[PDB]
C-alpha cells in the first residue's frame, strides 16, 4: 500500500499585530502526527498521535529549533511579499507551504512535493522533476530568479529524496499497528416524505476511513447526475467520515432505485436499496 508524509506550514499577519503567528503541522498517511504553534506559552513541536511519544528528548528539542528557524524564514518572507505586491501596511496576509513525499507500495520514492501560496493563491512550486520552478505571478518572478540563482532546488531535492523519505520509513515502522488500516463504510437508506406523492431516498455511508468515497444512485442501470443531492464528505469527529446522497422518487416506485457505495476499504462496491 502506498504511503506519504506532509508538513503544512502557515504564517499569518493581522492589521492589529506586531508579529505574524506561525503554525506547522505534520502528517503521516494524512493523519496528523506533530504540530507547532507560536501562539503557545512554550512553543514546541508536540506529538499528536499516541505513536509519537516514542521520540526522545533530542527529537522534540531539535525539531523545535527548526520550527523557530522556519518562523523567522516566514516572517522575513511576508515582509518581502508585501513589497513585491506594493501592498500598503494595513491588511491581513497569509503565506503557506506544503512539503513532503509519496511512496509506492514498494516503499520507494514516487514523488516529491514543495509548494507555496501567498493570500490563498499559488505563488511558487517545485516541479515534479525537483529541478525547475513554476511561478505564475509577475511579482513572483523575483523569488523564482533568487531561488534559481541560489541552487534552492537542489537543496529541497536533497531533503525531499533523503531526510524526508528516511524519516517516513522510520515513522512507518514505529506505528505499524494502525497506519495501513482502512475502515469500510456501513451504508443504509432512510425514507423521508417530500412534495405531494414524492419522497426522498437518502443513502448514508458511515464509519469509513479514509475519506475518499463515491455514492451513486441508479434507475435500473442509469446513473443519476440529474439533480442528485449529496453533501461534502465530513468528519464524524471520532476519526471516521460520513457522506450521503439522496434522490426524489415517485411514491411506490421506490425499488427501481439502487444506491452504490465505492470505497477502497471494500471487498467490492456495495449495492443498496430502500428496505421497509
Amino acid at each position: 500500500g502506498p504511503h506519504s508524509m506532509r508538513y503544512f506550514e502557515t504564517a499569518v499577519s493581522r492589521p492589529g499585530l506586531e508579529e505574524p503567528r506561525y503554525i506547522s503541522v505534520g502528517y503521516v498517511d494524512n493523519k496528523e502526527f506533530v504540530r507547532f504553534d507560536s501562539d503557545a506559552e512554550n512553543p514546541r513541536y508536540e506529538p499528536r498521535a499516541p505513536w509519537m511519544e516514542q521520540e526522545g528528548p533530542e527529537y522534540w528539542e531539535r525539531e523545535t529549533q527548526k520550527a523557530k528557524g522556519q518562523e523567522q524564514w516566514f516572517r522575513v518572507s511576508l515582509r518581502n511579499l508585501l513589497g513585491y505586491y506594493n501592498q500598503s501596511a494595513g491588511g491581513s496576509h497569509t503565506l503557506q507551504q506544503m512539503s513532503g513525499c509519496d511512496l509506492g507500495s514498494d516503499w520507494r520514492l514516487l514523488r516529491g512535493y514543495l509548494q507555496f501560496a501567498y493570500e490563498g493563491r499559488d505563488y511558487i512550486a517545485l516541479n515534479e522533476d525537483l529541478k525547475t520552478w513554476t511561478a505564475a505571478d509577475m511579482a513572483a518572478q523575483i523569488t523564482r530568479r533568487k531561488w534559481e540563482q541560489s541552487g534552492a532546488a537542489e537543496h529541497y531535492k536533497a531533503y525531499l529524496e533523503g531526510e524526508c523519505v528516511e524519516w517516513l520509513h522510520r515513522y512507518l515502522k514505529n506505528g505499524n499497528a494502525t497506519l495501513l488500516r482502512t475502515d469500510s463504510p456501513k451504508a443504509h437508506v432512510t425514507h423521508h416524505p417530500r412534495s405531494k406523492g414524492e419522497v426522498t431516498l437518502r443513502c448514508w455511508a458511515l464509519g469509513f476511513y479514509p475519506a475518499d468515497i463515491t455514492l451513486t444512485w441508479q434507475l435500473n442501470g442509469e446513473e443519476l447526475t440529474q439533480d442528485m443531492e449529496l453533501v461534502e464528505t465530513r468528519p464524524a469527529g471520532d476519526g471516521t467520515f460520513q457522506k450521503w446522497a439522496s434522490v426524489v422518487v415517485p411514491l411506490g416506485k421506490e425499488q427501481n432505485y439502487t444506491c452504490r457505495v465505492y470505497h477502497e476499504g471494500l471487498p467490492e462496491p456495495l449495492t443498496l436499496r430502500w428496505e421497509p
Partner: protein
C-alpha cells in the same frame, strides 16, 4: 482574497431523543483563516464548545470542526453561527436531524 466559509451542522451518531450524542459544526473552504464559530441551542450561546486546531487543505483553504455534547429532544433547536470577514453579517445554519 476572501473565500466564504461552507457550513454543515450534523450529529456524530444517528440522533435519538434522550440519548447523548455529539453535535458538529464543520466549517470549510474559507480564507483568510481568522474566523468565529459559536454553536447555539434555542437561540443562545452554548458554553463548552470544542474547537479543532487550524488546518488547511491541499487547495490551500482552511477548515475547522467545532463540536459539543448534547442530548436531542423533540423541542430544542440547534444552530451554528459563523462570523467571517468574507460575509457582511454572521451566518447561522440550523441543525436538520435528517441530514
Amino acid at each position: 482574497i476572501q473565500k466564504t466559509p461552507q457550513i454543515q451542522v450534523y450529529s456524530r451518531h444517528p440522533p435519538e431523543n434522550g440519548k447523548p450524542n455529539i453535535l458538529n459544526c464543520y466549517v470549510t473552504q474559507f480564507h483568510p483563516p481568522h474566523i468565529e464559530i459559536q454553536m447555539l441551542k434555542n437561540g443562545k450561546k452554548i458554553p463548552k464548545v470544542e474547537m479543532s486546531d487550524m488546518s488547511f487543505s491541499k487547495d490551500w483553504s482552511f477548515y475547522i470542526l467545532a463540536h459539543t455534547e448534547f442530548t436531542p429532544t423533540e423541542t430544542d433547536t440547534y444552530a451554528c453561527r459563523v462570523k467571517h470577514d468574507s460575509m457582511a453579517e454572521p451566518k447561522t445554519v440550523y441543525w436538520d436531524r435528517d441530514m
